């Protein structure tokens, strides 16, 4: 029996959702996601692994009087995009980078309805920003920045302890992308990784260090 979906407040207008799956060859993997509230509207940062969890997550917010305005997926893997098919079926707007959509189509998965290309994208002006630091954990990975709180959702890019599965990784690119991310978001109050506990800006440094080590052990 896996743990039930968890929803907890991280900051004003910000909640973290945690979902769990048994992953072949990796054991039980926890996935952190965010829900960001603007007025009476709610935005999903990453979907839980499954439609069932995504439906539960949406319901929890709908019950509390919020309209689900949009969803954004950090990268193509199912821990970020699992709910897209369901969200699309409910006509709830879904967002991903053009690269992520290309990779999804490739993986035989349902694509986000809306896509953006380019480094910066403001899902909500002045409140939610998507940033692409370049290839790392995957070619398409992006981070989400909340300026009003200085909270960065690292997603699966942030890897303090180990890089994890390198199957889709760009090992050569990653240290450079990490350096770029650290320079841009060193100011961050909080960093929320996908697969590990919430932390301060130091997670950016650790990720860069891990990325360099991985490339080296790699040579
Ligand atoms: C469900 C995730 C996809 S990012 C996964 O398989 N793993 C494998 C180990 C932890 C985590 C990771 O690569 O970050
Ligand atoms: Zn991944
Ligand atoms: Zn992941």
Numbering used by the authors: 21 to 239
What does the study report here?
β-Lactam-containing compounds remain the most important antibiotics in clinical use, but their effectiveness is threatened by increasing resistance. β-Lactam resistance is most importantly mediated by serine- and zinc-dependent metallo-β-lactamases (SBLs and MBLs, respectively), which catalyze β-lactam hydrolysis. We report systematic studies on the inhibition of four clinically relevant MBLs (IMP-1, VIM-2, SPM-1, and NDM-1) and the model MBL BcII by the four captopril stereoisomers and both enantiomers of a captopril derivative, 1-(2-mercaptobenzoyl)pyrrolidine-2-carboxylic acid (d- and l-MBP).
We determined high-resolution crystal structures for d- and l-captopril in complex with IMP-1 (1.71- and 2.01-Å resolutions, respectively), VIM-2 (1.40- and 1.20-Å resolutions, respectively), and BcII (1.18- and 1.10-Å resolutions, respectively). IMP-1 is thus apparently a special case, i.e., both the l- and d-captopril isomers bind in similar modes with the inhibitor carboxylate positioned to interact with Lys224IMP-1. This observation of relatively potent inhibition of IMP-1 by l-captopril correlates with the observation that for IMP-1, but none of the other MBLs, the l-captopril carboxylate favors binding to Lys224IMP-1.
